């Protein structure tokens, strides 16, 4: 399957017009991974930093492309994005003000991304771990090394740990390559195709736990593991073939169950204690309201909050507005914090009060934007 990218351009901190800030271009929910993301100043291309390819639960990809600084003095900035799902490159300009609408547990995840031979310019194998959506480990088929993605990961883990997993990943990389070939032979096609794996567990706020192991082919769910019944789910006749093979090995299934239920949860708690400083902190949001003519729409921004769990909506006198509204979703700030936003198109009438409702610590925060 092929899914068009969602794009949002915004600033790390609220622009002071005299104060250099970070321009961000966030591209998410796209597939395949092939992506061209450029930042533009008045139409010209600018030197910008790009994050490692990251993976979501739905098998899509996302990237944060940021610029060194944007003093923002009487200029016009935008973002250019080229993708296989776009004929003409989509351009999104940065405004003083779409998509979104997606909307306190802890989890650990490990992702794999295979790319059918040849390389196609992209690394054929990639593996990255996440805890609470925080990057921790990074491996790829180019540089075959372990590589911690967090400071508190590398500090609390000896060199013998990374040495051991740098060897395992090389083994898993090769096995992944073989399964990718086998699939293409089963689907009776060749050329560019992708192979993805996601495993992990999560620890719920009350002490409950769950775990999952899943596989995707070309962005679509392929094989899904049930650790309770010790059986694999297949949504395709071709996926059914692997199902019958994998289920034939009982020791493997049992092994998966134990890791997800016992081993994984242990790794999660261990990592949480390591990053206790970063993960257990909470920084309140800074709300900002603005308006743009042409009939007019209102904007509400919430800056620099952690964790990402947040709820934000517009109100009218003083009830919530479900009509003519947009949700930015949770966006990476780049500081390790996050920011979002919500907009409303107004038929203003007379004497109506419009105010922004935000709940973070909950801790309900309301800012009155506008009234006739």
């Amino acid at each position, epitope marked *: 399957i092929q899914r068009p990218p969602k794009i949002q351009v915004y600033s790390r901190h609220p622009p002071e017009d005299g104060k250099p800030n970070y321009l961000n271009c966030y591209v998410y929910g796209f597939h395949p991974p092939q992506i061209e993301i450029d930042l533009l100043k008045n139409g010209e291309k600018i030197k910008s930093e790009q994050s490692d390819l990251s993976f979501s639960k739905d098998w899509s990809f996302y990237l944060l492309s940021h610029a060194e600084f944007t003093p923002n003095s009487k200029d016009q900035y935008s973002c250019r994005v080229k993708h296989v799902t776009l004929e003409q490159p989509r351009i999104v300009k940065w405004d003083r003000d779409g998509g979104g609408s997606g909307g306190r547990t802890h989890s650990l995840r490990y992702f794999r991304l295979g790319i059918s031979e040849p390389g196609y310019g992209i690394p054929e194998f990639i593996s990255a771990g996440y805890v609470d959506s925080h990057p921790i480990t990074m491996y790829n088929s180019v540089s075959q090394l372990k590589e911690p993605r967090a400071l508190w990961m590398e500090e609390n883990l000896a060199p013998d740990h990374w040495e051991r*997993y740098t060897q395992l990943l*090389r083994g898993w990389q090769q096995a992944f390559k073989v399964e990718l070939k086998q699939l293409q032979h089963h689907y009776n096609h060749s050329g560019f195709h992708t192979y993805q794996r996601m495993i992990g567990c999560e620890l719920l706020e009350d002490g409950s736990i769950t775990g999952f192991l899943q596989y995707a082919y070309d962005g679509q769910d392929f094989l899904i593991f049930n650790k309770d019944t010790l059986s694999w789910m297949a949504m395709d006749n071709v996926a059914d073939i692997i199902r019958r093979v994998w289920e034939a090995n009982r020791h493997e299934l049992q092994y998966q169950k*134990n890791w997800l239920e016992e081993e994984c949860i242990a790794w999660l708690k261990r990592f949480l204690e390591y990053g206790k400083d970063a993960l257990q902190r909470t920084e309140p949001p800074k709300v900002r309201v603005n308006h743009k003519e042409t009939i007019t729409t209102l904007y509400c921004r919430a800056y620099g909050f952690y964790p990402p769990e947040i709820s934000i909506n517009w109100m009218k006198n003083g009830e919530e507005i479900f009509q003519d509204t947009d949700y930015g979703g949770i966006l990476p700030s780049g500081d390790g914090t996050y920011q979002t936003w919500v907009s409303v198109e107004l038929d203003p009438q007379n004497g109506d009060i419009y105010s922004c409702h935000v709940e973070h610590g909950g801790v309900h925060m309301v800012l009155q934007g506008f009234q006739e």
Partner: antibody
Amino acid sequence: NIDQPTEMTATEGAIVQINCTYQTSGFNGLFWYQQHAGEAPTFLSYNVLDGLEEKGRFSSFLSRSKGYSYLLLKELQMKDSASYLCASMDSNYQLIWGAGTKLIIKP
Amino acid sequence: AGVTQTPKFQVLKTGQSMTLQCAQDMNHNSMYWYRQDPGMGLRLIYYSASEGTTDKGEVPNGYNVSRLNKREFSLRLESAAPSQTSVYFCASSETDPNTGELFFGEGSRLTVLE
């Protein structure tokens, strides 16, 4: 660390139980190998979840809470005389081998 | 099929170089080299997850290793020592982690005399 009885003697046709205790960081499984004298070991059983795994005359029990396992040999034949190796996996997938239990079967 | 290992017997004067041959017909990925001694569970000297990569084990000291093909993993000791007298097992598994069923070579009997 992993421990099992050094030597065990039993008569042919009888039943025998070889205990194996292990203390490791994590647990990814526990293996039993049979190794005849002067020969290469052979895979016997693999246990991860708590319970009993029976194959023919052989059965392998595991307790993850107790860190305990036993290989249970029923209806002992002469060919059963061998060394029986016990091994388990760490949190990392490394394998720890116990010095086996030499089983001597008297006719 | 199975893991093939040679030689099965060697006597060496200390200081001599010798290499043990191991080949796997099972199209596996991971390969190991084990040393078995009396009163001790098997120890891993060296292993490889797949072809093109190898890494030291519990007791790498005095040993080297190489993966030629996906089929072959050879154990090399450049300078023989009396402490290296043992029965060397070359083992092969389809993939790491899961060793079982782990396949062992016939075994290689090594005695090093001054």
